[PDB]
């Protein structure tokens, strides 16, 4: 099965759980796509089912919370890429980035809040990824 | 044919047509890619040729118009994801987002301006998408 | 081989080289992915190994440097798409865009800084792309 893809969104203003405060992981409640069921909605983590090149994209949308944030795409406790978002009232802004990375079976991909907080919720945030092609 | 992909850009300063004012749809005049010819440039809509997982990306670039905007990727006239863009003169701002969604044959994907306007044009804006992989009748239909 | 993909990032605060000032090309020092080895790290340019539809994405992250910038994706010395980024101190912001384009073998893809400068470095910047599917004559 070379068909692997997932897509998740934050669909509500709801505040960060105590677990979020603890783990600093950005959680996505609603999953539009999860072929291969390789994305664990509970931990909001993608576990690669096989060795290959995966694509990832994320947009973390925040509101005026008096805070500036930094989101990082994580690979097994290692940062791959980072995105930033300032603080102002006129609009929402997004910490967005994307990348191709090689993953091994059982490698974990997820988003971490490296800085700031997501008070006021992070509605409209998105996290998606898919296997571009596998490797031997 | 599992090869399906399209790419369109806004290449001019030109203002929104009177049609745009009514439909609130973001139109892209120049098409760089349209394999399968499933993207109709005139109405700027992607009609899925088959059931599968599709990727979509868009960057809507605006100029200072005293309004803040919200762009949404639409699936059969209902929003899937949204992007925002502030109001600023020193620079252009982009309402950007992207997502993977399941589509059925005849499902329509396009960008609609949920709020604000694009006076001053939306030059350099981009909208693209492609079939990641198809699906058979074993998979249930998507909820949207 | 229909497997072609590359991914590069700017991992340091380091300033633009004297070469960068001349060519206006945005350079990425660290390569996360380069299947087919079609991405030249030295010149930060992707040379298409075959005719097909390629996907490209880039995020150029700048800091407060008294300048506003414009980054463009170049195809054989011609701009395809562009991105912009204002100037303010409260945060970093990114000039981001992406597109699908048809390329033939030997076509060159790279990022050029059309305006402003990247003093203060462009750390956390990203540039990636891959062959979606090939095409025949
Ligand atoms: C999480 O931390 C914030 C402070 O950043 C606090 O206001 C909030 O009550 C905490 N939420 C939970 C569920 O612990
Ligand atoms: C569209 O509406 C705006 C105000 O929302 C108006 O200024 C503009 O003139 C309208 N478009 C045209 C073509 O008249
Ligand atoms: C590159 O150019 C900028 C401004 O044009 C200048 O401040 C900087 O010193 C230059 N760097 C080198 C290495 O020439």
Alpha carbon separation from B123 to B16, B119, C120, C127 (Å, rounded): 11, 11, 29, 22
DSSP E strands: which ranges in chain A? 5-9, 30-35, 39-40, 45-47, 52-62, 69-75, 78-85, 93-103, 108-115, 126-134
- Resolution as reported, in Å: 2.8
- For the Cβ of C115 lying below 6 angstroms from any atom of ligand 3, the answer is no
**B36 close to B2: Cβ distance less than 8 angstroms:** no
Technique that determined the structure: X-ray
- Which letter does DSSP use for residue A22 in this model? H
The answer for residues whose C-beta is within 8 angstroms of residue B22's C-beta and 6 or more apart is: none
Which atom number of ligand 2 is nearest to the Cα of residue B18? 13
Say how far apart CA A111 and CA A80 lie, in whole Å. Answer: 10
Alpha carbon nearest to ligand 1 atom 5, residue:
A117
Q: At residue A3, what are phi and psi to the nearest 5 degrees?
A: -100, 105
Full DSSP string of B20-65: HHHH-BPP--EEEEEETT-EETTTTEEE-SSSEEEEEEEEEEE---
Nearest to A109 by CA among A70, A71, A80: A80
- For the Cβ of C18 lying below 6 angstroms from any atom of ligand 3, the answer is yes
Task: Using an 8 Å CB-CB cutoff, list chain B residues near A125.
Answer: none
Half-sphere exposure of B87 (CA within 13 A, CB side): 12
Alpha carbon separation from C84 to B38, B87, B91, C14, C64 (Å, rounded): 30, 14, 7, 21, 14
Say how far apart CA A72 and CA A110 lie, in whole Å. Answer: 8
Contact B53 A33 (CB under 8 A): yes
CATH code, C94: 2.60.120.40
**C75 close to C103: Cβ distance less than 8 angstroms:** yes
**A69 close to A113: Cβ distance less than 8 angstroms:** yes
Say how far apart CA C132 and CA C127 lie, in whole Å. Answer: 16
SS (H, E, C) B77-103: CEEEEEEEECCCCCCCEEEEEEEEEEE
Say how far apart CA B144 and CA B75 lie, in whole Å. Answer: 8
**A55 close to B99: Cβ distance less than 8 angstroms:** no
Task: Using an 8 Å CB-CB cutoff, list chain B residues near C132.
Answer: 5, 130
Return the ligand number nearest the Cα of C23: 3
Alpha carbon separation from A62 to A113, B83, C60 (Å, rounded): 12, 11, 20
Task: Using an 8 Å CB-CB cutoff, list chain A residues near B53.
Answer: 3, 5, 33, 35, 130
Say how far apart CA C62 and CA C124 lie, in whole Å. Answer: 9
**A2 close to A35: Cβ distance less than 8 angstroms:** no
CA A41 from centroid of its chain's CA atoms: 11
- For the Cβ of A117 lying below 6 angstroms from any atom of ligand 1, the answer is yes
Output the CA angle B61-B64-B66, nearest 5 degrees. 125
- How many domains would you assign to chain B? 1
Cβ atoms within 10 Å, residue C84: 22
Say how far apart CA B117 and CA B21 lie, in whole Å. Answer: 8
Q: Could you tell me if residue A132 is left (phi over 0), alpha (psi between -120 and 50 degrees) or otherwise beta? A: alpha
Which residues share a beta bridge with B133? B53
Tell me which residue range forms the domain holding A2. 1-136
DSSP E strands: which ranges in C10-107? 30-35, 39-40, 45-47, 52-62, 69-75, 78-85, 93-103
Say how far apart CA B122 and CA A77 lie, in whole Å. Answer: 40
Mark A52-84 as b/e (b = at least 16 C-beta within 10 Å). bbbbbbbbbbbbeeebbbbbbbbbeeeebbbbb
Say how far apart CA A110 and CA A101 lie, in whole Å. Answer: 13
Cβ atoms within 10 Å, residue A6: 26
Contact C98 B5 (CB under 8 A): no
The answer for residues whose C-beta is within 8 angstroms of residue B91's C-beta and 6 or more apart is: C68, C84, C85, C86, C87
The answer for residues whose C-beta is within 8 angstroms of residue A126's C-beta and 6 or more apart is: A7, A8, A9, A10, A28, A57, A58, A59, B81, B97, B98, B99
Say how far apart CA A28 and CA A35 lie, in whole Å. Answer: 16
Nearest 10 degrees: CA dihedral of B115, B120, B123, B125? -10
Cβ atoms within 10 Å, residue C36: 18
């Amino acid at each position: 099965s070379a068909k692997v893809a997932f897509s998740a969104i934050r669909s509500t203003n709801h505040e960060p759980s105590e677990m979020s405060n603890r783990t600093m992981i950005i959680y996505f409640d609603q999953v539009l796509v999860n072929i291969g069921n390789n994305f664990d909605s509970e931990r909001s983590t993608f576990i690669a089912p096989r060795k290959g090149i995966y694509s990832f994209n994320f947009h973390v949308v925040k509101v005026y919370n008096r805070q500036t944030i930094q989101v990082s795409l994580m690979l097994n406790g290692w940062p791959v890429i980072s995105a930033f978002a300032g603080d102002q009232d006129v609009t929402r802004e997004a910490a967005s980035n994307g990348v191709l990375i090689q993953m091994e079976k059982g490698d974990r991909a997820y988003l971490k809040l490296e800085r700031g907080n997501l008070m006021g919720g992070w509605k409209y945030s998105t996290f998606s990824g898919f296997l571009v092609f596998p490797l031997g």
